[PDB]
Amino acid sequence: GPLGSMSQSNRELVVDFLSYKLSQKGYSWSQMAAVKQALREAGDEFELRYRRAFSDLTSQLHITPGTAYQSFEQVVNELFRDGVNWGRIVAFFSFGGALCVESVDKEMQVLVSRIAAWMATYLNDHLEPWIQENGGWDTFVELYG
Amino acid sequence: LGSMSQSNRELVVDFLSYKLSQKGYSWSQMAAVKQALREAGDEFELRYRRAFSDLTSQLHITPGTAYQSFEQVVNELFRDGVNWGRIVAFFSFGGALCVESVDKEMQVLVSRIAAWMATYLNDHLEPWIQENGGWDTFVELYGNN
Numbered sequence: 514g515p516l517g518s519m520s521q522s523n524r525e526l527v528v529d530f531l532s533y534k535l536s537q538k539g540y541s542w543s544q545m546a547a548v549k550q551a552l553r554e555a556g557d558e559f560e561l562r563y564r565r566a567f568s569d570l571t572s573q574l575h576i577t578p579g580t581a582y583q584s585f586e587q588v589v590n591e592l593f594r595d596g597v598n599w600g601r602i603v604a605f606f607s608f609g610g611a612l613c614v615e616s617v618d619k620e621m622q623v624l625v626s627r628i629a630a631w632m633a634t635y636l637n638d639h640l641e642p643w644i645q646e647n648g649g650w651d652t653f654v655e656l657y658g
Numbered sequence: 659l660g661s662m663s664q665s666n667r668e669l670v671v672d673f674l675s676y677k678l679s680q681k682g683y684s685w686s687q688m689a690a691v692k693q694a695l696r697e698a699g700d701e702f703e704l705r706y707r708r709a710f711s712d713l714t715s716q717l718h719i720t721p722g723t724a725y726q727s728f729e730q731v732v733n734e735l736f737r738d739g740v741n742w743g744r745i746v747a748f749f750s751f752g753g754a755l756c757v758e759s760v761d762k763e764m765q766v767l768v769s770r771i772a773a774w775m776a777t778y779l780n781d782h783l784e785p786w787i788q789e790n791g792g793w794d795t796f797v798e799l800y801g802n803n
């Protein structure tokens with residue numbers, strides 16, 4: 514298969530394609546596939562609607578090469594200052610996405626895999642308990658799918 | 659079975675992959691191939707929708723089908739040679755048969771098809787790809803940067 518970050522399997526490519534085509538017909542490869550698709554669409558809608566807020570995010574959010582997770586965390590804490598909800602979680606993904614895009618634009622491709630790791634960290638440590646306690650991603654799909 | 663910390667990471671990588679792809683950027687070669695193939699599949703199905711009527715009764719592939727029979731059926735699609743167009747067709751036909759299998763409440767057939775396709779890709783099509791420009795050539799031909 515094509516070279517991926519963690520393997521190069523042909524199954525992974527097949528499963529990706531089949532997941533896509535099932536979702537187009539209102540079906541799902543799996544619950545994870547359904548969550549992924551729901552979040553993509555949630556992200557798309559949020560970005561179009563709140564497009565004015567997506568300008569020079571690397572500056573406003575202070576994300577540069579050499580940023581450390583602790584700095585990333587203080588920044589993202591501000592988004593959730595008044596509590597966690599699904600809308601803010603969507604925003605978290607969307608802002609993170611826009612930052613990876615901005616990074617590549619600026620020939621700072623090196624930030625992409627670091628932003629991914631920081632997001633994962635923050636999810637695990639700050640958001641997972643709220644998510645679990647509020648129905649899991651199953652509830653997200655019921656609300657945003 | 660699963661694990662949620664991995665789940666969260668998977669969600670992150672998926673979303674970022676998607677958002678990068680929209681700007682013509684890519685997470686990895688694997689991600690670039692996934693985008694390109696989804697797109698190629700959409701275009702194939704838009705052009706050849708006529709061929710997707712009652713595939714189940716025509717392709718003679720059921721849950722009890724052996725891989726060798728699956729192989730003989732797919733071989734027929736490539737009877738006159740392998741080309742990029744036909745490799746796209748292979749995915750789209752697999753996709754459509756999966757959707758029908760869901761329509762007919764034979765969901766069990768979906769994972770079987772996935773496994774058969776991964777094997778056929780591994781054994782038949784990927785070797786041809788490697789003689790014809792590699793996955794990088796597929797991305798140049800069907801991808802968005």
Ligand SMILES: CCCN(C(=O)N[C@@H](CSCC(C)C)C(=O)O)C(=O)c1cccc(C#Cc2ccc(F)cc2F)c1
Pocket residue numbers: 563566570573574588589591592600601604605606608609610612628632
């Ligand atoms: C520069 C962005 C400022 N900002 C913002 O424009 N928000 C927008 C949309 S959020 C409103 C509700 C309905 C979801 C607004 O105020 O209209 C924020 O909400 C905000 C405030 C504080 C921190 C952050 C952040 C972040 C962040 C950084 C890295 C990362 F990977 C993910 C992130 F969310 C975002």
Ligand SMILES: CCCN(C(=O)N[C@@H](CSCC(C)C)C(=O)O)C(=O)c1cccc(C#Cc2ccc(F)cc2F)c1
Pocket residue numbers: 706709713716717719731732734735743744747748749751752753755771775
């Ligand atoms: C029921 C006939 C389906 N079929 C078809 O209608 N073709 C159309 C032309 S489609 C456009 C060209 C460029 C591919 C036709 O015959 O007019 C085929 O060409 C065909 C013939 C023989 C086998 C297959 C297949 C398959 C297949 C099954 C499972 C799977 F996972 C993947 C597959 F490709 C597809």
